[PDB]
Amino acid sequence: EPPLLPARWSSAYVSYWSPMLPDDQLTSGYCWFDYERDICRIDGLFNPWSERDTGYRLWMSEVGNAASGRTWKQKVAYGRERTALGEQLCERPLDDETGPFAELFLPRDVLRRLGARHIGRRVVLGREADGWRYQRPGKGPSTLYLDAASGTPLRMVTGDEASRASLRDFPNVSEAEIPDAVFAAKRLEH
């Protein structure tokens, strides 16, 4: 039987792509998943985000509350300008955005509910990890690599890594209690 994810976990993340196409970015941030509260949070430069199409790079903090079914997003745009010194970045916050949020980005029981199959051990972040491969119905395959000893997430592959996939690595997972203020939202009217 596939395992459940930890009841609560938080970690830095590193987000990138396989293969790395020329516009693909390597970014970092922090994330928190609390399955008992049924809420998650992700803070970092949004990946993927087309600066060419939009005119800016986006930083975002998102609190996705699956219990209430609503997400809250705090966004800051970083756009390029030209000055006497050369190129400069200018920050511009956006008003907070809200919308529907039907499930957490990585549900605790995802491997059980989607019928994941074990595809062997892989060295991920310096130790053996269990690979669990499953189909996201109507979307495509995913593989979640879990630390073989602790069961904590190490790498989330969304898509087929041998063709085209997002990779997210979790180098320092903690199962410690998460203060509820981590998941608080507020109105930001600019």
Can you give the binding site for a second copy, defined by CB under 8 A?
12, 14, 16, 18-21, 26-30, 43-45, 57, 59, 61, 74, 76, 78, 80, 83, 85-89, 91-93, 124-126, 162-163, 167, 169, 171-172, 174, 176-182, 188, 190
DSSP conformational letter for 174: B
As measured in angstroms, the least distance from the Cβ of 183 to a second copy is: 11
Q: What separation in angstroms does the CA of 8 have from each of 35, 85, 184?
A: 6, 47, 17
Nearer to a second copy, 29 or 107 (CB): 29
As measured in angstroms, the least distance from the Cβ of 84 to a second copy is: 9
Which ranges constitute the DSSP H helices of the chain?
51-54, 110-113
Nearer to a second copy, 106 or 129 (CB): 129
Nearer to a second copy, 112 or 152 (CB): 152
DSSP conformational letter for 107: -
Whether 96 contacts 185, CB under 8 Å:
yes
As measured in angstroms, the least distance from the Cβ of 38 to a second copy is: 20
Nearer to a second copy, 14 or 106 (CB): 14
C-alpha 109/C-alpha 49 separation (Å) is 29
Is residue 164 classed as helix, strand or coil in its secondary structure? strand
Nearer to a second copy, 97 or 103 (CB): 97
As measured in angstroms, the least distance from the Cβ of 56 to a second copy is: 11
Sequence-distant (≥ 6) Cβ neighbours of residue 56 within 8 angstroms: 77, 78, 79, 92
As measured in angstroms, the least distance from the Cβ of 184 to a second copy is: 8
Q: How many CB atoms lie within 10 A of CB 149?
A: 10
